[PDB]
């Protein structure tokens, strides 16, 4: 058979024909070769389950052997799966920087990554500098931002500011960035974004051994437990250095702290495959974490 597949990066759409024996690795390799990406360790191919979950393709398995939702064409999103600890030291290629910028900016503008208003205005000004270059008055006259989506809806809704007021606040900062190259505006954006509480955190709905609703966060530095209505402030923090072991079986997951005296933290996921995906992200993040320290 010849199966039709689309892979979308943040700024490219690729249509492929594959065969039943094509592996995720072979699809991934063709994607990164087409776009010129060398820093591949951060990225993966996301898809929708037969039951509607967003998960990552296994590159060491056949594409059809995984339970990708049966549609034509098959739809994959080439996205960052792991985040660096410091964008300045770790994102060396310009394409890598731009793919992280677009993906992060998308999550900020769609309210998936919480951002307070003052930070949102400042981030928008660096995105403006990245798109328009230097603020020039022969080129940029009043209303030049009216067609740009610049701020998260949550920021708009709070605040009684009109569009022109938001655009003037952003314009003030845009003027401040005069002379900044477009790749430096992109990296400046990411330096601010990487300090946000929700940046680079994979959230999973989980439950206490009592049944209370919580969130688990998996990120580059370890695991966090959050209250149900506060994904900004971790209730309990488990950096890798403070974890003795982690285990899962079926739906149950257990974190043992480096200190026997300290109690185990026990939580439940809704499905076995969620626990597998949590652990896949723990192992990948733990692995990159150790690699940075060689």
């Amino acid at each position: 058979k010849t199966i039709s597949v689309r892979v979308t990066t943040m700024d490219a759409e690729l249509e492929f024909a594959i065969q039943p024996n094509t592996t995720g690795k072979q699809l991934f390799d063709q994607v990164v070769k087409t776009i010129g990406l060398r820093e591949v360790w951060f990225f993966g191919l996301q898809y929708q389950d037969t039951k509607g979950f967003s998960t990552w393709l296994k590159l060491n398995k056949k594409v059809t052997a995984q339970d990708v939702r049966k549609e034509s064409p098959l739809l994959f999103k080439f996205r960052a799966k792991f985040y660096p600890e410091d964008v300045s030291e770790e994102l060396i290629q310009d394409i890598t920087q731009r793919l992280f910028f677009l993906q992060v900016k998308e999550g900020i503008l769609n309210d998936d990554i919480y951002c307070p208003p003052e930070t949102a205005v400042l981030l928008a000004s660096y995105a403006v500098q990245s798109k328009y270059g230097d603020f020039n008055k022969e080129v940029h006259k009043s209303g030049y931002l009216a067609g740009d989506k610049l701020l998260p809806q949550r920021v708009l809704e709070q605040h009684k500011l009109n569009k022109d007021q938001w655009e003037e606040r952003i314009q003030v900062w845009h003027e401040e960035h005069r002379g900044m190259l477009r790749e430096d505006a992109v990296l400046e954006y990411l330096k601010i974004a990487q300090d946000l509480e929700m940046y680079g955190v994979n959230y999973f709905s989980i439950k206490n051994k009592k049944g209370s609703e919580l969130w688990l966060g998996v990120d580059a530095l370890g695991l966090n437990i959050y209250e149900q209505n506060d994904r900004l402030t971790p209730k309990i923090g488990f950096p890798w250095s403070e974890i003795r072991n982690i285990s899962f079986n079926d739906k149950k997951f257990v974190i043992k702290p480096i200190d026997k005296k300290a109690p185990d933290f026990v939580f439940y996921a809704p499905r076995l495959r969620i626990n597998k995906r949590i652990l896949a992200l723990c192992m990948g993040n733990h692995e990159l974490y150790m690699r940075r320290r060689k």
């Binding site: 039709s4 597949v5 700024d11 490219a12 759409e13 690729l14 249509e15 492929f16 024909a17 594959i18 065969q19 024996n21 094509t22 072979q26 699809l27 063709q30 087409t34 798109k131």
Partner: peptide, 14 residues
């Protein structure tokens, strides 16, 4: 052998 074959491309500049 069974490498994927590129059939179409769209590039978004901005």
């Amino acid at each position: 052998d069974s490498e994927p074959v590129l059939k179409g491309v769209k590039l978004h500049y901005t």
